[PDB]
Design a protein around this ligand. Structure first.
Ligand SMILES: CN(c1ccc2ccccc2c1)S(=O)(=O)c1ccc2[nH]c(=O)c(=O)[nH]c2c1
Ligand SMILES: CN(c1ccc2ccccc2c1)S(=O)(=O)c1ccc2[nH]c(=O)c(=O)[nH]c2c1
Ligand SMILES: CN(c1ccc2ccccc2c1)S(=O)(=O)c1ccc2[nH]c(=O)c(=O)[nH]c2c1
Ligand SMILES: CN(c1ccc2ccccc2c1)S(=O)(=O)c1ccc2[nH]c(=O)c(=O)[nH]c2c1
Ligand SMILES: [N+]
Ligand SMILES: [N+]
Ligand SMILES: [N+]
Ligand SMILES: [N+]
Lengths: 396, 396, 396, 396
């Protein structure tokens, strides 16, 4: 059992392991396209002394963080251990090797989507965004008097074929991702795959349609089996107006009973209706997971709330360093120190605070975050909070 | 159709309407006890010219709000219109009369739990707390290395009969409610009813048990039909230690597959586990609804975040007044003004901001809250936020 | 294995067989009351040579038939063969003995409700009324502009306790049953049992409520398990106004999602709504079964449609006689003849035509009814039709 | 927002709206075929000032009505409003324009199938046929002694491939539709589509088979997911013999548990069995909707029951005219008059009476039909009744 960068000949064996490991495997041709997002020496495989029994790689991503700052980000994916080689520490070995390479390459953070919630905490990843499924019973949905775009004249939203308005979706998304924490640059090969999935599949998914506003879009399809359910695969709106207009159109799907979407906890849709309860939270789960590779670089790179006054403290990350942290004017200064720690946390906890999705208070209550001073807690809470709500861009 | 305060002879007719209107009706003897919480002239009925076709009342409550300040609160309940007298504006008439009496009596706020989410917005009530159901698959639940109370020696939690430790529950709850936004004083007659419901019912609910810590308790029962589900009716913990200890005991219910609880969005339980995902959010709904009766009294009474600096603005409440609002040192000054409004919102929106459960940013995105200045939004967001997470005390 | 009229000592053995045979067995005290409806020598039992292994009886009933004519009717019930004595022809023996006694006593017809649809055809019983379950999704239900009782002022319907308005229900029902084909006199002991069942049962049915109009009533209860379903046990309306008023009140049960009722195929409720489809037919089954004991007496006793002109024919009932049938002025003359048959049918088929619930055309298409002349078919169809729709009074 | 007849260039936009609006959309090539049934100027579209946001058309159909009389009929279909343009009265505008064109073209009636039951009443359409789903548990089904085709020798029914016996199905159907109220001429392009749908679909419907008698056929397929359910898509029988023979063959599908069919309320199948209850009514819904465009032409065109004697009255249709109606010898005379109305009803109600599917008595009980004379009601009931049961030909 050796650990190497894969050669061209290794990939058919990797695709086999992929097919066996992932029920939503996109298949060899799509997989061959996604390869273009993997840097040279961005992949590891494990051979048995030879077929492939383990694999992992990272992609070059650009993650938006609070203060509209864009970080180079190593996005872990295509992780699999053969069912024949469990409990041999192959994952620990592969993750260690990639983290070495990611760190040495100069990525401040790494990110992944977790198949299970129990795996990636021990490797320093913390869940940093939250997915919220809303299901609307649209037959009772009435917009509030206060809701935008409820006037006379025409609608600014059009029903269109996805494939004929790629450029407009690309442009809207590009604006969206640059201004939202959790935003990722979506490269060309992922747009190719998105509009491929919008096509009807013989014995699979139904045809997708688009609702297009100057400052927003929504892609939706009727569900395979539940023919009174419309599934919004993606809604991206840059203005509140666009967001309201798109939801007026979706509630206008008079042949559906229910509209479902995977969104974020601060989605304003409930507040657009006279009955907030009509937008039911059906499902909730961790989205993007974050590992802070370089604590000072990451902490210094993001913006902080201007509201909290200037304050200083000492943060110790377990087996990750100890730093004098000074925050003010929504910027941070983070420098080495041997002064006594005021705040203590594992690396994963930091990942979870970083995009402002979790309150320090809350993690402290679980004792994932230690401090003897509760004024400091309030200050961290306020400083690390994001004024733009954190969202999840896309699974990778 | 007249509107009067009920006489003693009206109550049997009110109980009939109650029985017909509410599937969880506690019944005449329990109802006769709850009457003791209704002040003289706290009830209205509508007779048909004579049986009772409409009723509503309020109870005298004490609501804890941010800054550990306790407000006299009119709690609306026992609201019903006979199915024979719908669409006659009997609710509008009853609500108007009670709001007159509540205001004139000097209550700064009124509160209710809503049967439907579409009714009470138009009468100035906004949803002010959020209920979160967590269901834990306890067969996989492992506590984190960092979680309190995972050491050698004995457990500080005891399994007990609820009826034999009323005093200890009363004392813990009393401490809890005084330090948590959303806390309500629970009077003696409600404790009587809580420990009555802890008893096994022939063909009904099963026997309830208690887990008791010096600084917390939990009441739980196995579900009627799902015999692998334990339902935590109530968990109240004053320290993080107590909260963790109680959850160690509940995960120790080795004959159950799942533990469910109705809690709040900031419950730290997910973070006590190695797999946060094991604590699934199964259900989410509005809890306590709040109507600000006197805007300046209410705004001046609660505390605000010390973190945000001093700032001033002008708030207009629709058909509710316009005020110079000055906030600093976590106190507010709220005085009449005819100066131009900087912030605009209906009375209900204010109710929803008041306990810090909803962000001003979020309501602004839905246009329930208007301002042309986004710096003011951030400032309101931070000021109205509660450092202690807002919770829901009990249904009334 | 002998066949006798039961003595007082036989009844405890009959109650045992009842308990074992009928899951809805009303129990010994209720059963002892219903005994008062059984005439002397109205019961048979079969003993094993001695415990009871078979039983059957009839009750003295009064059945309304078209033309508002009331027939003495033998109502078969309490029929059971022990599971130890199947396929011994005990039912054939008991039915034969009772039919002998019923015929000799001078009943023109006998009637029953069938546990299964495959049993009673061979003993000359045909299904003569049809049960229709309507389930209304009351959240969308809007009454038509044309529907009665949608004006200003007050409602004439009251919500009441069933037990306090027995007299008014008795009176309304008495009017109802005398003017509707399928109507049965409900004796005092059945009213006692109806208002006993309206009471809440520990671990059983919930409390029943009543909607009372001068010319109609409805008894309803919320379902045991589905707490958003109201079950209308009984609705009896003498005028269209009463029927519409009662349905306005039932749709006014704003806490329910669905209202269900067992009614008849010609119930006008669908036509009271703007969306007829909201009143869904969820279930449909044979109601009352009829055996014509004396063909000429029965045919001569009921009224016929005045619309069809005078016509004459010869009807042969298989092993039941052949008759010259002359119909005109909505009366029939039925006399012995040896003239050639024009119409042929088994006795059961006649039962099914008798109250006008089945068309002769339809039974002819199945060849249950033979004739070489289709003009005669049309004439029978029209003559046997009832202008008042046939309904089902109550199970016995 | 303008309203025009579509040009060739409009149709790709209409197909897009179709795809988005109808989950069972037959697709562009099938849709292009059905276009051949639309007359010149039989279609309207609404453009936004330009993509298509509204459309509606009618097809030229031939409807059989009581007395085996065949009426030219405008069949409304392909009706859709974009979800972006709800509540702009686009449907009201389109329906008005088409009704103008239909009336001026000289159609006595128009017809449609309704997606929802709440829409088309206000445009003068009434539901005129009833769909009945019967599900038979064929494992218990035994034919009655009286049922045809239960003798020795061979069976006259053959199992065949649908595509190889098109001619025989066409011929049987042509005979069927000419003798049944609700019958529609099925043009060649609809036969092409029927036998296309009889083919197995990759990941869709299974292969269809046919049972063929000289005077009847049945097309059936096993259900996609429930492999013990056979779905009879279509059964057309011209003689009772054919109908019984076909059902003997279907009950002979020994590998199925249940056979389901969408039929009519007077289907004799229940009466062919020893247990009528085995043929369960699982589902019931409005079929064909009818709008009487020209009251006197329509009323004069159909036949009436010969059984009822000659009678005269005055019918007022709301905003539709007032007529002296004289009925006798199963013909009607309908002429203008200003004499006082004896009968009053909206146009939709007339549609519902026209094919004899609804009794006048029943609509009167709901007050959809007004008269102060109940003898007239009985007379209308009998006159408008159809001796051949009304059926539904096919969805359009
Ligand atoms: C989406 N896919 C990607 C993702 C990144 C890739 C990078 C290079 C080459 C191919 C790539 C394919 S993929 O191959 O279907 C894929 C991958 C990992 C997965 N992990 C899971 O736990 C799961 O449930 N489904 C997964 C699907
Ligand atoms: C809990 N109950 C109270 C509450 C307050 C009371 C005050 C005075 C006298 C009796 C009282 C009884 S109660 O009577 O079962 C009750 C009341 C209102 C309800 N409203 C609802 O929408 C519902 O679903 N269930 C309800 C149950
Ligand atoms: C309703 N009941 C009657 C009916 C008639 C009686 C006459 C004399 C004494 C007692 C009587 C009790 S009863 O005893 O629960 C009863 C009877 C027959 C039944 N047959 C069935 O197939 C069934 O499912 N449930 C039945 C229930
Ligand atoms: C059956 N189809 C027809 C019907 C008539 C047509 C006339 C000209 C051109 C194409 C045509 C297509 S169609 O295009 O799939 C179609 C149409 C309307 C529908 N309305 C509904 O409410 C629904 O649920 N499904 C529908 C399906
Ligand atoms: N941000
Ligand atoms: N607080
Ligand atoms: N009758
Ligand atoms: N006919």
């Amino acid at each position: 059992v050796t650990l190497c960068s894969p050669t061209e000949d290794d990939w058919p064996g990797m695709f086999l392991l992929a097919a066996a490991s992932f029920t939503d495997f996109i298949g060899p041709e799509s997989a061959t396209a996604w390869r273009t997002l993997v840097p040279t020496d961005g992949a590891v495989v494990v051979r048995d002394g030879s077929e492939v029994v383990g694999m992992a790689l990272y992609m070059d991503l650009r993650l938006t963080v609070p203060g509209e700052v864009v970080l180079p980000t190593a996005g872990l994916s295509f992780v699999a251990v053969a069912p024949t080689h469990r409990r041999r520490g192959l994952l620990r070995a592969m993750c260690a090797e990639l983290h070495r390479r990611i760190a040495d390459s100069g990525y401040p953070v790494a990110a992944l989507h977790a198949s299970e919630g129990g795996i990636y905490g021990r490797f320093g990843y913390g869940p940093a965004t939250t997915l919220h499924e809303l299901t609307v019973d649209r037959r009772f949905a009435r917009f509030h008097a206060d809701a935008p775009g409820g006037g006379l004249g025409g609608s600014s939203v059009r029903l269109v074929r996805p494939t004929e308005h790629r450029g407009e979706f690309e442009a809207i998304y590009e604006r969206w991702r640059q201004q939202v924490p959790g935003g990722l640059l979506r490269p060309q090969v992922l747009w190719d795959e998105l509009l491929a999935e919008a096509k009807a599949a013989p014995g699979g998914d139904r045809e997708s349609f688009a609702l297009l506003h100057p400052d927003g879009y929504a892609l939706y399809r009727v569900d395979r089996t539940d023919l009174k359910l419309a599934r919004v695969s993606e809604l991206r709106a840059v203005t509140a107006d666009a967001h309201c207009a798109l939801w007026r159109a979706l509630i206008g799907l008079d042949s559906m009973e229910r509209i479902s979407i995977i969104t974020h906890p601060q989605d304003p849709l409930p507040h657009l209706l006279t009955d907030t309860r009509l937008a039911r939270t059906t499902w909730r789960q961790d989205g993007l997971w974050l590992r802070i590779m370089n604590v000072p670089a990451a902490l210094e790179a993001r913006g902080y709330a201007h509201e909290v006054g200037e304050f200083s403290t000492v943060l110790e990350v377990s087996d990750g360093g100890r730093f004098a942290l000074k925050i003010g004017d929504g910027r941070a200064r983070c420098t080495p120190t041997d002064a006594a720690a005021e705040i203590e946390m594992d690396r994963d906890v930091l990942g979870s605070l970083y995009l402002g999705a979790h309150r320090a208070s809350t993690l402290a209550a679980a004792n994932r975050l230690r401090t003897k001073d509760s004024q400091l807690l309030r200050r961290l809470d306020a400083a690390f909070a994001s004024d733009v709500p954190v969202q999840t861009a896309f699974e990778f």
